[PDB]
Amino acid sequence: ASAYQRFEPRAYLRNNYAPPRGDLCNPNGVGPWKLRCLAQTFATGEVSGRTLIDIGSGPTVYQLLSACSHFEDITMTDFLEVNRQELGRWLQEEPGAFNWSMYSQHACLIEGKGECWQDKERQLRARVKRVLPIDVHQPQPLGAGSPAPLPADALVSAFCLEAVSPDLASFQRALDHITTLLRPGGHLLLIGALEESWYLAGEARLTVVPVSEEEVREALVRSGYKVRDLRTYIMPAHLQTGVDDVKGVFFAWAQKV
Amino acid sequence: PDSAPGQAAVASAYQRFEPRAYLRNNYAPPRGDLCNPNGVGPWKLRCLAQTFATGEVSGRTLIDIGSGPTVYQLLSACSHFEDITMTDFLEVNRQELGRWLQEEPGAFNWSMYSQHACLIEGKGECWQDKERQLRARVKRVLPIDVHQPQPLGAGSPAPLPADALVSAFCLEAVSPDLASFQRALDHITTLLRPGGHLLLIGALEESWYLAGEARLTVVPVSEEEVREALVRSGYKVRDLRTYIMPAHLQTGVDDVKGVFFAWAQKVG
Numbered sequence: 001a002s003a004y005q006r007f008e009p010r011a012y013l014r015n016n017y018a019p020p021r022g023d024l025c026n027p028n029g030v031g032p033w034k035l036r037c038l039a040q041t042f043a044t045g046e047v048s049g050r051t052l053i054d055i056g057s058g059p060t061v062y063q064l065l066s067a068c069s070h071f072e073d074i075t076m077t078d079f080l081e082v083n084r085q086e087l088g089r090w091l092q093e094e095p096g097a098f099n100w101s102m103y104s105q106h107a108c109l110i111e112g113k114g115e116c117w118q119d120k121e122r123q124l125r126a127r128v129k130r131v132l133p134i135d136v137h138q139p140q141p142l143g144a145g146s147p148a149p150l151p152a153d154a155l156v157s158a159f160c161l162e163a164v165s166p167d168l169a170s171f172q173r174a175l176d177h178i179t180t181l182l183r184p185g186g187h188l189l190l191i192g193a194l195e196e197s198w199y200l201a202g203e204a205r206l207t208v209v210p211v212s213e214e215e216v217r218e219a220l221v222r223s224g225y226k227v228r229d230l231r232t233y234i235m236p237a238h239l240q241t242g243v244d245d246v247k248g249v250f251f252a253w254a255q256k257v
Numbered sequence: 258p259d260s261a262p263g264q265a266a267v268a269s270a271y272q273r274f275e276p277r278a279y280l281r282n283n284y285a286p287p288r289g290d291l292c293n294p295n296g297v298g299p300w301k302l303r304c305l306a307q308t309f310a311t312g313e314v315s316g317r318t319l320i321d322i323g324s325g326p327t328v329y330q331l332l333s334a335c336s337h338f339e340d341i342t343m344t345d346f347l348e349v350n351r352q353e354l355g356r357w358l359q360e361e362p363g364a365f366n367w368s369m370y371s372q373h374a375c376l377i378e379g380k381g382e383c384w385q386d387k388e389r390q391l392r393a394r395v396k397r398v399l400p401i402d403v404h405q406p407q408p409l410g411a412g413s414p415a416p417l418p419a420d421a422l423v424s425a426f427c428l429e430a431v432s433p434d435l436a437s438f439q440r441a442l443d444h445i446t447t448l449l450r451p452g453g454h455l456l457l458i459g460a461l462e463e464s465w466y467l468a469g470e471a472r473l474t475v476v477p478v479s480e481e482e483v484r485e486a487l488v489r490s491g492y493k494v495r496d497l498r499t500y501i502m503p504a505h506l507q508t509g510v511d512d513v514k515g516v517f518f519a520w521a522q523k524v525g
């Protein structure tokens with residue numbers, strides 16, 4: 001964890017959400033694939049309710065772009081103060097906020113409701129009620145007296161669990177911890193890196209547990225979920241850039257039984 | 258009657274036309290707000306998109322008539338024509354297009370329109386690709402006077418005859434009266450091949466608009482007058498739609514009551 005104290009949000013954003021990984025023009029790219037997974041899942045109309053919590057949001061909002069129109073109360077979270085501040089800058093439209101508009105545009109494009117990207121962002125900013133500290137290693141990841149409405153009707157989390165866990169076991173426990181935040185019959189949308197061991201965020205060099213699709217499937221099962229959907233994106237050569245060693249990205253739609 | 262005087266007044270008035278003021282008056286918010294699906298921006302784009310989506314309007318060459326400083330009218334068209342000719346009476350408008358073509362920062366920003374076109378075309382295209390294709394496909398930007406029997410002049414560079422014509426807010430805005438309008442329509446029709454298509458957008462019952470210092474006269478026309486002119490010019494009218502300007506889009510930049518869209522096909 002101490003490694004995360006060197007984590008630079010801007011370097012992370014630049015490494016993963018600016019070209020080439022952040023060019024959304026190519027439909028075969030990872031950015032479009034992720035947004036498409038999220039969009040399609042919400043378009044089924046089976047993931048719904050009043051409140052949602054995003055786990056380990058970091059400095060990113062793309063993971064909620066499709067979500068925000070299904071949940072009137074959204075709580076975003078991260079372990080790091082610097083990440084929560086970077087979120088603030090975007091949520092409050094403060095100077096030097098990250099430009100997510102390519103992702104907003106592409107989400108509007110994929111969803112196919114003819115919505116302008118500005119309305120999309122407006123709705124996201126309006127529904128994100130609070131940004132809270134979190135530690136998925138604690139049995140109560142949000143603390144004891146959290147301002148967050150619990151239990152949530154739905155969880156989202158992207159690139160967090162594998163990226164903060166030393167090994168499979170710690171990964172499984174983290175999953176158990178966040179699962180307690182979710183109402184029975186509720187939904188989890190989980191995005192993660194496949195077979196990754198490290199990545200860079202400026203001066204920070206972080207350790208990642210290398211996990212497979214079957215390992216992810218089994219963990220979800222062991223945590224008491226029914227796996228509704230589990231998809232893999234194999235990382236093409238051109239998006240393997242020296243900022244990490246990720247091999248693929250997985251998307252899992254799980255329902256707490 | 259005699260047309261020269263009226264046409265001379267038009268030419269004179271346009272010497273004060275200010276492209277930036279025009280762009281801001283008509284293509285920046287609220288008229289340029291593409292978020293409201295009931296707004297005039299989305300309606301125009303939809304009309305053009307849907308028309309091209311029939312697949313009935315294709316060919317190799319397209320001529321946009323009186324482009325002015327705008328490109329929105331070509332956003333859906335550019336997927337269907339490899340060779341596009343843009344045109345305008347005013348050099349300053351052609352320069353404005355020059356800026357956009359060169360992708361200069363000082364150029365007007367059409368990205369809201371590009372994105373929206375991509376949104377309704379429903380092909381998952383990013384707006385940067387839409388724009389890159391339009392820039393690639395614009396082969397020339399030429400002077401034009403619709404009041405001349407040969408609007409492009411004698412021996413123009415443009416591929417003639419064209420397979421398709423586009424024209425937005427030009428004819429009525431440069432014609433002193435309906436007779437002049439009809440002649441202008443007759444003139445541009447000589448540029449279209451038999452069997453080719455005209456997509457025409459225009460103001461209904463407009464008599465004036467502002468472009469900075471310039472205040473310009475417009476012949477007020479109705480939908481029925483437009484239909485009859487198209488028939489009179491040798492077209493079969495395939496589609497003619499009317500958009501009624503809502504009060505909140507009537508901003509004192511003009512006295513437009515509505516916008517027409519016409520899809521017409523030249524007989525032959």
Ligand SMILES: Nc1ncnc2c1ncn2[C@@H]1O[C@H](CSCC[C@H](N)C(=O)O)[C@@H](O)[C@H]1O
Pocket residue numbers: 001004007055056057058059060063078079080083134135136137157158159160163164
């Ligand atoms: N012990 C812990 N508990 C919960 N989140 C943690 C954590 N240690 C680090 N994090 C956060 O986990 C994130 C991994 S990076 C991914 C962030 C974002 N959700 C994405 O999709 O890009 C970082 O924001 C990091 O600060």
Ligand SMILES: Nc1ncnc2c1ncn2[C@@H]1O[C@H](CSCC[C@H](N)C(=O)O)[C@@H](O)[C@H]1O
Pocket residue numbers: 267271274283322323324325326327330345346347350401402403404424425426427430431
């Ligand atoms: N005699 C003439 N022949 C052809 N175009 C003319 C003309 N006199 C003025 N114009 C052009 O007619 C245009 C009307 S404004 C409309 C411009 C653009 N097509 C749009 O949709 O906004 C101006 O650009 C003006 O310069």
Ligand SMILES: Cn1c(N)nc2ccccc21
Pocket residue numbers: 016017021030031159193196199244246249
């Ligand atoms: C590992 N990883 C993170 N943390 N963000 C990403 C975006 C695209 C591809 C891989 C990514």
Ligand SMILES: Cn1c(N)nc2ccccc21
Pocket residue numbers: 283284288297298426460463466511513516
């Ligand atoms: C008359 N007119 C022009 N010339 N451009 C317009 C855009 C929207 C609505 C009306 C318009």
